[PDB]
Structures are given as structure tokens and as C-alpha cells.
Design a protein around this ligand. Structure first.
Ligand SMILES: CC(=O)Nc1ccc(NC(=O)c2ccc(C(C)=O)o2)cc1
Ligand SMILES: CC(=O)Nc1ccc(NC(=O)c2ccc(C(C)=O)o2)cc1
Ligand SMILES: CC(=O)Nc1ccc(NC(=O)c2ccc(C(C)=O)o2)cc1
Ligand SMILES: CC(=O)Nc1ccc(NC(=O)c2ccc(C(C)=O)o2)cc1
Ligand SMILES: CC(=O)Nc1ccc(NC(=O)c2ccc(C(C)=O)o2)cc1
Ligand SMILES: CC(=O)Nc1ccc(NC(=O)c2ccc(C(C)=O)o2)cc1
Lengths: 328, 328, 328
């Protein structure tokens, strides 16, 4: 049935946010979002629905829609409309900007796909980043219709007392970090995301956890305030980068594992940098550092035979990628 | 006569600002600029003269100069030197920065032409945007020689009373929007621009009017203050985008008409976004949103046979483009 | 001996900052840095050591390492860690960020090398600019570990009294300008840099001096405060641009000499522009204008046979380049 096929496409799209392609993973992600906030989940699901539908509308590639490569940007768009809204939860007028920007996502996903086709690089979350930055800059904190949360630059020296760091909460920053990929902050939605990643590919889960831990640790090395690390606002740019470089767009080897860790460090430090730069505009560093760091690590040309950049036409999940590479 | 040939080249250049190639259209545009401000028109005409002359100087392509593709950036440069100047009208020292930056325009127009040659995209107004942003950032509001008008970010919630909107002035925002392509604000110079566009291609006029109206309407959907919409500071990024996607760089079809309308919406919202971001630097969103939106709509790859991206070597005006396409 | 080979590679790397490839030039540059500040020189030398070492680590090209194209970014990174540090000289904890960012430089140098390979353009200092901007934005002035010097935008009209300009100091801005390529401010380290450039290629020295003078003069045309020009914060973006366009990446001709002067003007004005824009973030215009101006002048396509863009595989120094061109 066409309706069932479209629903399958929309679940897969949700999943593609943590680099997974599995309807069960998508349904678990939706369950976790319902655990966090029903309003956020409704906005995100509507966003991915509109993104996929307009992907079909503008005669896009059927395989890309069927694999969810046109619905992962929309779900994030809806979620961070619902996160960076000052009007409070269940503000139904916020759905209209979700409509417009979700329809706008595939246009960017195709234009940037044409730009990044020469060098064979994925668009990543760049269509989303552009769309949500456009929204949060066009509106800002001072609308009468769709205001946003006020983000301000640091103007005083932070007070960090290292003798009162909560190590248990610091370790809790790992599951919370895997859940800020969607902007959620509940530890249990993070655990649900871990399970959803594991049911598809265990190596994706391992890289996500190690990247979140590594983004935490990189945040502690520049005296980032403890409140953020606990929420994960430090961890997420690192999870996506680690999953990207570990086994998704390379072949998994120990050299590539170390390169993924290095990309996680670069993503964390670039997260701090872009969070301090984009804050003057009133904008958050919403998955820009992941995009830039993982693009600059995927463009790396090295003579090491172990670091092999897989063609984009043969990327499903790290285990299948590894088997494909040893087969050839 | 070489002098007459150069004058013909300079008139055509002026016209190329609203996507038209006709000396009569150029002379009508110059007449409209004289209606608005003799000082602004003098600065802009000198800017396009220098841009064309330095295009000949740096051994650029003869056809591009003869068709005005090297004088449209300069005229805008001169005009927005004369608009964003705090020293008042008839400040003769402002001509020297016009000299320098107009000479700088073709260099960018060729460099970005080489960058955008692989994907077959026009440079658009990017050489101008870079040049005028460079000027207005290098000087700013606090020089002793060439100060600029102070642009500040929003710091208070605007007071919009929808019961006192001037609908007649709101509809007047359409001709005013077609005149802010040159930075002018007189309704009658807008009407002169409409006539100049119509004498060449009626479809360009239709797309310009519909894009200005659409940029207006998109501005009203984010509670943009009424004073700006009336001036058109909302309308212009949409006119150029609509003319671009309607019949200039595509073949005119109903699908392409709807895509041009969508590009107009994207240009308007990106205009709001970049006007709120670039304001912190003290810079205006001078035709950046048109460039970005129309590039991201011209890079779109779709399977729909009706959306055909014309080769850049066969783009004159939408009617000729349509006849060329049906001929082949 | 491998140790001697690595030391030779590291000296050459230092030199490549002023577009020179000569171990004697490198040792003279290190001597000049020791004249300026032993702490800055230690940080910069450690930075280039780490950059070269990680270039070998990530299986990069042997010829590029042996010619120093992977150590020039690191030395600048270390130097401007030591310049933009608020903790004072001999703050040993600053070495760790130097480690991390110097290791990060070759990754960007390879990624951007792959991007700029299609159009045959050099990466320039872009890997460095990205790395140091990332550092100075991630930390800023308000850390507890690695604070930076506070940079603020202009908020009042500067008071310039042209009747009390120090012409001798103004002329001293030329050697000081050739020394701000490394962030040093001593006139004598500038003279040592002049000698180091001359021992390799006199034409590099001539272009550097003329570019520094031209950046000075371009700074005086926009009422730049006299204190900066004396330090050279105006001169350096122009020296590198002039050396780039004169004889390094083109064949030296009078037309190309004038084009190099024009690139110096563009670099100076873009230096002012980016110094006023990036200041709101708290960031300096650390060799961004040189990169952008010289890229936009190296992408220029002109019909003039005298302006010949040399293939990147045959660029050693302007005299050898000229002899190579006349040979073919
Ligand atoms: C020929 C070609 O480009 N194919 C191709 C294009 C794009 C992608 N991208 C992804 O799977 C993807 C994009 C973004 C993300 C995330 C989680 O950020 O994941 C795969 C294959
Ligand atoms: C002082 C300051 O900037 N705090 C601050 C730091 C980071 C962010 N960004 C996010 O929370 C965020 C959440 C989710 C995302 C996604 C899904 O891309 O991005 C906001 C505020
Ligand atoms: C081979 C090739 O690129 N030819 C080619 C290059 C550039 C253009 N551009 C234009 O006509 C143009 C540029 C900018 C604008 C406006 C009004 O913004 O209009 C056409 C043909
Ligand atoms: C608060 C605020 O930013 N107001 C504001 C909004 C928009 C502009 N931009 C322009 O007026 C403009 C005029 C003409 C152009 C062209 C020819 O590109 O660009 C200035 C100030
Ligand atoms: C095939 C190819 O790209 N070869 C190639 C690549 C890069 C360079 N770059 C340089 O020498 C260089 C880079 C940066 C600088 C400075 C002082 O900024 O100088 C030469 C040749
Ligand atoms: C008000 C203001 O911005 N002053 C200001 C102007 C310019 C700079 N930039 C530099 O000093 C600099 C030094 C060395 C470099 C290199 C090696 O790239 O870049 C800092 C402060």
C-alpha cells in the first residue's frame, strides 16, 4: 500500500539522523521523543512528513526517498523549531514555519548534493543547518508571532569549582549526548537511542558512545561550564562525527577508528568555537561543527592504504561496508 | 564609433540589473534614477563606467562587455555608495571609493565566474555583494572620510498595530519594491522600471511584479515592521529571484513559475535572516539573499522534464529562451 | 640522518611563510623570532615541529613535507597562540593547545587541497586561519585556562591629527610590516626577514617591500588610526598578497607586477573590512584578507597572454619560474 510505503519512508528518515536505516530504530526513536516531549515529537514528525512529501513532489530520486535521505533533515527542523521557541509547549502556530522550512529542506539537500557531487561528499546536515539558521535568524527573540530563546555571548569570567564536579552526572553526559542529536535532554531517551542504534549496527553504537565521551572530555579541556556538559550541548557534534568517520563513510580499521576519534575532538572544539561565534547573532551551533569537521576529515587524502574512502553508492552500515570492502 | 559603442555598452549594463538587455531600458532606468536623486545616479553611472572600462582593461571577453555583463555590478556599487553614506548628498569625495570598488568588481566577476563555471551557474550579484560589503565593513559608521549609515540590531519587541495598516501603501510596495533593486525609493522610479522591463520582455515584468508582491506577503508573515515593507526593503530580493527562476535561467513553464514563486519566498525569508544577522556588523543585506536563494534553486536537480536548466550560453530573455527550447 | 632530514624540513617550513624555500632563510627567521620574543619563537617552532610530524604521521606526500608545505601553517599557529594570549609570556600550559592545533593543521591543508585541486589553487594559509580562528573563538577572553586578548569593535569616532603624523615611523612601517607576517613587531626582526628573503630571491624581497608600503598607503586612505599602521597590522596582508601575485604563482611581467599591486590594495582594504567585521566576535583578521584577495586574483581569467597562471607543479621562486616559462 502506498500509505504504508510512505510511513515506512518516514520512519527510516527519522533514523537516518543517527546514521541508521531501520524502521524499528525509527519507531524506537519516535518512542524516545514521546518520552521527552509529545509536542517536540509532533513537530518533528510533521517536519519529516512534509520533507519526504515535498521530496516526492519535486520529482526527486526514488531510492533516496525510500531510504530516508530526504526526511532526516525535516525531523530535526521540526524538533529544533519546538526547542528554540519562547512561546512554550503546545503553541500550534509554530507548525506553519515547520511546514515551510521542511518543504525547503529537500531543495537545499539537492542543491548542495549537486555541489558536493564532484568531490563525492554527503550533504550531511547542511540543508538542515541552513534552514534552521535561516529561521532562527529571520525571527530571533523579538517577534510578535514566532519568537525564539535568547542566546547571548559570554560577558563575564565563568566560575568553575572543580572540587564540586558531579562525576555521576558527568558520566550521564554520554547517554544525554546521544540524545541531543535530536535536541532532547532526557537520559532515558538517550538510552532508547542507544538501543535503536544497537539493533541495527553495534559498531554505530560503539562509535556514538565513544564520540559522546570524547566530546565531553574535549569540553572539560577548555573550561566549559559544567551545566552544559551535563545536558550534552557539548557531546552531540562529536557523536555524529565519530559515527561518520568510523565505519559509515570509511572502512572500519584501527587507523580509521583513531581518525574518527580525531574528528570527534575537532568537532567538539569547533562546537565550542561556533557556539561562541554564532551566539552574537543569537543563533545556536546546531550541528554545524559536525558538518564542517566531518567534511574536512572526509576530504582528507592520504597515502595510507587502510584509510579507504568508500564510494557513496555503497554505504549502508559499517559491517556491510566492511564486508563489501573485503569482498572486493 | 568607439565612443558610441562604449556608451551602448554602459547603458546595457545598467539594464542588466533587472535582468534586461536593451539600451532603451537602460536609458529609462537612468531617467528614473535622475527622478530619484541626481547624486545617486551620477555615482552609479560613474561606477558602471569604471567597471566596464576596467573590464576592457583586464582583457576580458568582448561579448560579455558588449552585452553588459560587466557593468551591472558597478552601477549598483555606485548607487549603494551614495545610499549608505552619512555625509549627505553631493559629497564629491565619495567618488574615489566608487572608482576603486568599481574597478574591483570585474576581478570578482571573473574569479567567481571561474568558480561557478564547473556547475554552470551565473556569478549573479556576488561580485557586487562582496565589493560593497567590503566597503561598508572597512569604513563603517566611524570614519573621518567615508562614514556610513548606522545599522543596528533589534533590541526591543516591535510594536505592530495591524488595525492601522495602510493597504494602499502596502500595494504601493510593489512598484517601490521594483525600485529598490537600485536602492531608490520613489514610486515613480519604480513605475519607470516597470516600463523599462516591459519594453524588452513582458514576462520579466510579470515575474518582477509577482515577486515583489510575494516578498511583501512573506514579510507580513514574520511581523516585519510596516515601515520597511512600504520602502521595499522587503520586496527587492524577491523580484530578482523571481525573474531569475521564472524565465531567465530556466524555460518558462507553470512548474517553473511555481518554482520561481518558491524561490521568491525563500529569498524573502533569507532576506529577513541576513538582515538580522548582518546588522550586528553594521551591514545591510544588499542582495545577498537573492544570490543565495537563486543559486540554491538553480542547482536543484529534479527528474521533472519540464524543469530544464538552460545552458548559460543561450540565455537572452524568457521569450527567446522559450522559442529556443521548443525549437530544439 | 633522519633527524637532520626532519630538522631541514622544519627550517624550510618556517621559511615558506614568506613564500621562500631555503634553510638559511629559515634559520635567519628563527634568529629574528629569538630577537623578538624567545617565548613566541619557542611556541612557533614547537608548532611547526608538530605540524610536520603529523604530516608524516597521516601518510602525506613526501615531497610536500620535504619542501615545507606542511610546516608553515604550524609555525604561524604557535606564534599567534603566543601573541593572542592574556596569561603573559612563558605560560607553559599554552603549549598543549599548540600541540592540538598544529596537529590539526595538515588535516585542513589536505582537505582544502582536495577542494582547491579542481581549479588549481594553493590552500594558502586557510588551514592556519581556520585553526587559529577556531582556537580564538573556542576560548575567547573569558576562560579559566587559555584566555585571549580582548578585541572590541570601534564605538567612537577616532581622533586623527594629520599634522602630528610621524613620517619616520610611517616609513618604519615597511620593515615592521614584513615582520607581522609572523606577528612580531620589532623593526630589526623585520630587517632580518628582508635579508632572509633576499638571500633566496631578490624579487620576493622587492615585492614584499612594495606590498608593505602599498598596504600602509591604502590604510592611510580610510583614516586608519596611526598606531596600527606603525605596528603593521595594516601592512602584512599586503606583503603576502604581493609576493603571491608578483612572481610566485604567475610569471613576472610588468602587467603581473601591476596586478600584484592591485592585489595588495585589495588585500589591504579587505584587511580593514575583516578587521572591523571579525572584531565583533573578538577575533583578529589573521591573514584572512591575504587568502581571499590572492585567491580572487589567482582565479582571474584574462585574455592577456602576459598574465600566465603557472601550474602549481612548477612553482619554486619567481626567477626560476620566469626561466621555466621562457624555456617553454
Ligand atoms: C551519490 C551520493 O551522493 N549518494 C549519497 C548522498 C548523501 C548520503 N548521506 C547520508 O546518508 C547522510 C546525510 C546526512 C546524514 C546525517 C546523519 O547527517 O547522513 C549518502 C549517499
Ligand atoms: C551559551 C550557549 O551558546 N549555549 C548553547 C550551546 C549549544 C546549543 N545548541 C543545541 O542545543 C542543539 C541542540 C540540538 C542541536 C541539533 C539537533 O543540532 O543543537 C544551544 C545553546
Ligand atoms: C558561460 C557563462 O557563464 N555565461 C554567463 C555568465 C553569467 C551570466 N549572468 C547574467 O546575465 C547576470 C549576472 C547577474 C545578473 C543579475 C541581474 O544579478 O544577471 C549570463 C551568462
Ligand atoms: C534594520 C535594517 O536592517 N533595515 C535595513 C533593511 C535592508 C537594507 N538593504 C537595502 O536597503 C538595500 C537597498 C538596495 C539594496 C541593493 C540594491 O542591493 O539593498 C538596509 C537597512
Ligand atoms: C598540486 C598542488 O596543489 N601543488 C601545490 C599546493 C600548494 C602550494 N602552496 C604554497 O607553496 C603555499 C601555501 C601557502 C603559502 C603561504 C606563504 O601562504 O604558500 C604550492 C604547490
Ligand atoms: C582593532 C583591531 O582589530 N586591531 C587589530 C588589527 C589586526 C590584528 N591582527 C594581527 O595582529 C595579526 C598579526 C599577525 C597575524 C598573522 C601572522 O596572520 O595577524 C589584531 C588586532
Amino acid at each position: 500500500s502506498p500509505v504504508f510505503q510512505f510511513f515506512d519512508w518516514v520512519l527510516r528518515g527519522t533514523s537516518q539522523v543517527m546514521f541508521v536505516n531501520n524502521p524499528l530504530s525509527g519507531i524506537l526513536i519516535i518512542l524516545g521523543l514521546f518520552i521527552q516531549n509529545p509536542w517536540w515529537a509532533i513537530s518533528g514528525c510533521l517536519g519529516t512528513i512534509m520533507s519526504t512529501l515535498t521530496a516526492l513532489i519535486l520529482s526527486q530520486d526514488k531510492s533516496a526517498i525510500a531510504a530516508g535521505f530526504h526526511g532526516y533533515n525535516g525531523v530535526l527542523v521540526g524538533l529544533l523549531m519546538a526547542v528554540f521557541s519562547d512561546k512554550g509547549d503546545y503553541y500550534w502556530w509554530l507548525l506553519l514555519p515547520v511546514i515551510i522550512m521542511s518543504m525547503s529542506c529537500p531543495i537545499l539537500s539537492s542543491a548542495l548534493g549537486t555541489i558536493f557531487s564532484k568531490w563525492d561528499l554527503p550533504v550531511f546536515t547542511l540543508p538542515f543547518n541552513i534552514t534552521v539558521t535561516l529561521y532562527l535568524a529571520a525571527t530571533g527573540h523579538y517577534n510578535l508571532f514566532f519568537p525564539t530563546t535568547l542566546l547571548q555571548p559570554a560577558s563575564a569570567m565563568p566560575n568553575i569549582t572543580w572540587s564540586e564536579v558531579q562525576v555521576p552526572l558527568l558520566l550521564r553526559a554520554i547517554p544525554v549526548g546521544i540524545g541531543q542529536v535530536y535536541g532532547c535532554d532526557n537520559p532515558w531517551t538517550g538510552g532508547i537511542f542507544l538501543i535503536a542504534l544497537f539493533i541495527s549496527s553495534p559498531l554505530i553504537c560503539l562509535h556514538a558512545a565513544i564520540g559522546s565521551t570524547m566530546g565531553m572530555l574535549a569540553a572539560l579541556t577548555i573550561a566549559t561550564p559544567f551545566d552544559s556538559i551535563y545536558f550534552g550541548l557539548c557531546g552531540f557534534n562529536s557523536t555524529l562525527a565519530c559515527i561518520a568517520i568510523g565505519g559509515m563513510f570509511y572502512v572500519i580499521t584501527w587507523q580509521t577508528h583513531l581518525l574518527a576519534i580525531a574528528c570527534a575532538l575537532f568537532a567538539a572544539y569547533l562546537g565550542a568555537a561556533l557556539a561562541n561565534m554564532l551566539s552574537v547573532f543569537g543563533l545556536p551551533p546546531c550541528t554545524w561543527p559536525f558538518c564542517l569537521s566531518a567534511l574536512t576529515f572526509l576530504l582528507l587524502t592520504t597515502n595510507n592504504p587502510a584509510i579507504y574512502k568508500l564510494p557513496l553508492s555503497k554505504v549502508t552500515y559499517p559491517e556491510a561496508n566492511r564486508i563489501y570492502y573485503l569482498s572486493q
